[PDB]
Amino acid sequence: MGKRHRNLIDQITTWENLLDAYRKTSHGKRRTWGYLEFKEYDLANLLALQAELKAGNYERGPYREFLVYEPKPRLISALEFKDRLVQHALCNIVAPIFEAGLLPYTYACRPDKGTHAGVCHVQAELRRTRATHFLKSDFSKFFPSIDRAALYAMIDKKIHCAATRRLLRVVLPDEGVGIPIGSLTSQLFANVYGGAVDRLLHDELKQRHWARYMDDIVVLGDDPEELRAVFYRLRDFASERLGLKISHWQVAPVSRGINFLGYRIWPTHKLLRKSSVKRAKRKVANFIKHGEDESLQRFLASWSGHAQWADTHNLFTWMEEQYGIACH
Amino acid sequence: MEPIEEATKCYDQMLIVERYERVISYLYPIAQSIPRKHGVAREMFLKCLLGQVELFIVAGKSNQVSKLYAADAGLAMLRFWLRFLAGIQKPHAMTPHQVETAQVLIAEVGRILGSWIARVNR
Amino acid sequence: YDQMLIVERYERVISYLYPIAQSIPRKHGVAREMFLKCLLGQVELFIVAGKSNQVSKLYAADAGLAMLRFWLRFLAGIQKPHAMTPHQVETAQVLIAEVGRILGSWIARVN
Amino acid sequence: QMLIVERYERVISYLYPIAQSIPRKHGVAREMFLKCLLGQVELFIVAGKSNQVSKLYAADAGLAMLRFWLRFLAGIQKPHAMTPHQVETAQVLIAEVGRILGSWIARVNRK
Amino acid sequence: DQMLIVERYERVISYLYPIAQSIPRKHGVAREMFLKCLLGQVELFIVAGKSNQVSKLYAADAGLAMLRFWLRFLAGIQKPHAMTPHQVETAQVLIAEVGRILGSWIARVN
Amino acid sequence: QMLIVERYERVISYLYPIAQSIPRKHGVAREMFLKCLLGQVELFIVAGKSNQVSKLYAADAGLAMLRFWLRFLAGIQKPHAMTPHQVETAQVLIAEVGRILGSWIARVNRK
RNA sequence: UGGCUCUGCCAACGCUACGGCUUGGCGGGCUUAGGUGGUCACGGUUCUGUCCUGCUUCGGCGAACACGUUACACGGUUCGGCAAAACGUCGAUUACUGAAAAUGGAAAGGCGGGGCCGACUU
RNA sequence: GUGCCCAUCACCU
RNA sequence: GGGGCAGGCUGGG
Ligand SMILES: Nc1ccn([C@H]2C[C@H](O)[C@@H](COP(=O)(O)OP(=O)(O)OP(=O)(O)O)O2)c(=O)n1
Ligand SMILES: [Mg+2]
Q1: CA B9, B10, B11, B16: dihedral to nearest 10 degrees?
Q2: Which of A193, A212, E107, F62 is deepest in the core (most CB within 10 A)?
């Protein structure tokens, strides 16, 4: 937008923004000690926060770091509500000046692009192009390997406001190698960072059929030797430039199915992943033999959304035949 | 910054009140819709509805189970008011749907009050 | 000190809120009367607190301040007619916070 | 005994219509009668959350006061009098609640 | 016994309620508070009778005392005259009768 | 008691005229002030019978609240109702009943 | 919000300190977001059935009944044409201005499709 | 803990 | 032999 971006801390601390940040920070969290301790004197709190940020005396409280295994062994660092609000107030001004440079085909944490617009992009870009092959790659330990330093050489060709820059650097120090997972600020800066590899695919490398979702990057081809090149070029880039090791890669013919984003996406069908099925099958079965066949309708409705995309007609018939419950 | 602290921070009082605020936010509009006649019923209903917040709040700060049971009595009376405003009020006051919605909200506050009574009772 | 100071600081709350609470339309008349009884009746809570030093009395002074902040939230929420503008809640919360601080220090001094 | 509330709720259902009827003229009496009538529910409720006979006697006092209100509202004069019928045909309803309250007092008293 | 006192206090109410409805709107808060003292003492008696703690029988006395205060207050409240001195005299006689019964009752319990 | 009330009657007789001068606008403040003023008599009286010092301190709180009302009506009420002189004169009368309340507190907590 | 410590008038429950007050009519005055769930980015051991045990570009991907792994049919995941503009991005926190880019500041151009225009469907 | 979707619930445009 | 599914049994909860 003329480039520049040189006065964002004025908009970040506009009361009308911090109130948006407040409502965004509290959205869903309204039964938490953080909201409820803040809610007390909410607008006096935001007036001391507005004026901490507007002074340059905001200092991020320490990340309360727990970890869950139920999704996957994580390393979830939470923040205090004040801190998530500062993050939300940054990421209301700063996010849309990054997420606008994000090439179309990055599907992660950006409004109006999701998991599901990605699988669809992929299928679609699989149907058109009549892709014969495809490179799927993935970044080793992505967030725990993001430079926090060549990140701030991207958070810094765009922020240009030397105070947003210093708030960005409070909320996320400019030294180390680990963007914290469980920060709004960090979902953004990881898309941005992995945006660098999108701009070594689409820009350099002239790859026009790809999709990246945060750390996973599908790259449909037609010559499997070219896609192997692309991959070597991507890995060399993301290793030398971004300090990202590529954990798994493959260059499969489109036939193995692209295990992308929870689905297995052939041109034609889009089976979901067996894990999902088995988890669901088991979840249902459990719910039945727990007498919890009413929260199962909630779960079922949920999983009927995750699977309305997938070609889960047969499987929905099958689950209706096994337990009777109204899947779709 | 450290959010402006109240003294005697009680999670349960804070949570209950935020959830009861939803009862009020549902019921206050329909307590204000009760006609001019049925004004005394309304004022008494509003004093029950808006005044339960004080019951919860005082329960929170003065940790005494007596005050928690008083909060329960108030929720019980609020449930009475729903019955009354539905049945005994003649124009309408509260549509059957509204009682069903309100009772759900009051039930949520009921749950939380119950849990809170229990955690204190131990 | 303590009770005298708290009350002089709370007088500023009253002096800010009483005007606001007298403006609340008759439609929201029960809310108003109850808000006024909360606002002008917190003085009694403070007064009783500094006539005993029973620390429960300064906790029910805190409860009253808490209820007063509820009233601010509530009066800002009521959208029939309308009452406390969001700004008024902000300003009031600052004043109540100052009384809150003093109550806190007083609770601590007794502790 | 929560049939108490549900047998009282027909006292309310009988008396409330004619209590809303009491003119502004008799407005304090009305407010106080309505607070007696609709507020006896709280007296019962508190009794049932405790089963202390004190609270049960308070419920009885309230029924007694409600009986007073009937006799008072009778001779309030002018076309606003609770008609003698209604005094008697509510005394019947209150008596039914009275019986149950009595049995409840007794059940508690002879544990 | 509660029944006797209340029937005798009903005479207070029956005398004073008319008079307490005549108190001018100017003295409207005093009036509503006097009416709430007057019809309202019945509850004090009734609670005293349907229970027993003797504090309740004192609270009934306090209420009668407050009612006596209201009479003296309303008599010469301002230029809008609320209660005529005669009315206070007549009312005080009736309140005195219920006073006597309350006294005897306090004594019988004591 | 008897003498406290006769001395407080003088407060009422001074303040009630002042409380009736508060404009309609501040009508809720007036009703609340009058309920403080005229309702302190009940506080004194109930202590008179039930001599428990608890009841006596509530009387003191009420006098204290009445002193707050003087402060409030002189300034915080925006057309400052009570003139500063009136607060001074009222405070003298309240002080006299304060003295008697103090002596009475002392007579009760002799041991 | 059955208001008004509010007036004019008229009555009469009444009450009067005889002035009124009250009370009743009768006019006027004042009066999408949120909540709650739930997807996607607990195992350990032997046992009993039951089934699978392929592929590989050597990274890995699978498989073991969702069984036609697929409602074998598509989602506007459509098909063309463009890419001027706007958007994005590099040019660039550059040229320039000015002591200093200092919370000034371009562009030509290059690259995109994210955009545009139709068709057909939505 | 963070976001994206799904369901359901209120609640008016 | 390894592997997936559903049940054995034991922890987490
Ligand atoms: N419960 C989770 C799981 C993941 N993420 C975020 C941060 C992750 O870095 C990112 C990508 O998810 P991955 O499943 O690929 O996990 P990693 O990036 O850490 O690498 P790997 O899967 O190889 O361990 O999504 C999250 O916020 N919350
Ligand atoms: Mg990874």
Answers
A1: -120
A2: A193
CA-nearest of A195, A217, A219 to A206 is A219
Question: Ligand 1: does its nearest atom lie under 6 Å from the Cβ of A261?
Answer: no
Cα dihedral value A200, A205, A208, A209, nearest 10: -80
A201 plus A220 within the same structural domain: yes
Kindly state the helix (H) or strand (E) to which residue A65 belongs, with its residue range. strand A64-65
Nearest CA to ligand 1 atom 12: A215
Number of domains in chain D: 1
Does the beta carbon of A73 lie inside 6 Å of ligand 1? no
Residue B97: inside a domain: yes
Residues A131 and A224 placed together within one structural domain of the fold: yes
Q: Which domain holds residue A41?
A: 9-97
For residue C31, the domain's CATH number is: 1.20.1440.60
**Residue F76 C-alpha, separation from nearest chain C C-alpha, in angstroms:** 5
The reply to whether B22 has its C-beta less than 7 Å from any atom of strand G is yes
**The total number of residues written for chain B in this structure:** 122
Q: Does the Cβ of A184 fall within 6 Å of ligand 1?
A: no
A273 Cβ contact partners less than 8 Å away, ≥ 6 residues apart: A259, A262, A263, A264
What are the chain F neighbours of C44 within 8 Å (beta carbons)? 61, 64-65, 68
**Closest residue to G54 (CA, C1′):** A256
**Chain A hits for C66, Cβ within 8 Å:** 40
Q: Show the tokens assigned to D107.
A: 């059940």
The CATH number assigned to the domain holding A245 equals 3.30.70.270
Measured between CA atoms, the residue of chain C closest to residue B23 is C74
> B71 in a domain, yes or no?
yes
Coil, helix or strand at residue A71: coil
Q: CA distances (Å), A136 to each of A129, A214, C90, in order?
A: 17, 13, 53
Resolution (A): 3.2
Binary contact (A41, C69; C-beta < 8 A) = yes
Q: Which residues pair with A133 in a beta bridge?
A: A253
Within window 251-310 on A, which residues have Cβ closer than 7 Å to strand G?
251-253, 256-257, 259, 261-262, 264, 266, 268-277, 279, 283, 295, 298-299, 301-303, 305-306, 308-310
Residue to test with chain E: of D22, D26, D28, most E Cβ within 10 A: D28
**Residue A207 placed within a domain:** yes
The closest of A61, F15, B115 to E29, measured between CA atoms, is F15
Domain containing F59: what range? 3-108
A311 is in an annotated binding site: no
Q: Is A74 part of any known ligand binding site?
A: yes
In a domain, residue A251? The reply is yes
Q: A144 and A127 share a domain?
A: yes
Q: Does residue B4 form part of some domain? A: no
| Contact in structure between A228 and A222 (CB atoms under 8 Å) | no
Residue at A109 is within a domain: no
Residue F86's closest CA among F67, F70, F97? F70
CA distance B92 to F78: 42
Is residue B98 within 8 A of residue B29, CB to CB? The reply is: no
Tell whether A88 and A31 lie within a shared domain: yes
Give the Cα separation of A243 and C22 in Å (integer).
64
CB pairs under 8 A between A and B: 38
Experimental method: cryo-EM
DSSP track, chain B: ----PPSS--HHHHHHHHHHHHHHHHHHHHHSSS-SSSHHHHHHHHHHHTTHHHHHHHHHHS--HHHHHHHHHHHHHHHHHHHHHHHTSSS-SS-HHHHHHHHHHHHHHHHHHHHHHHHHH-
DSSP annotation string for A84-111? HHHHHHHTTTTGGGTTTTS-TTB-SSBT
Q: Take atom 20 of ligand 1 and give the residue whose Cα is closest.
A: A141
Interface residue C86 vs chain A (CB under 8 A): yes
First-to-last CA distance in chain D?
A: 14
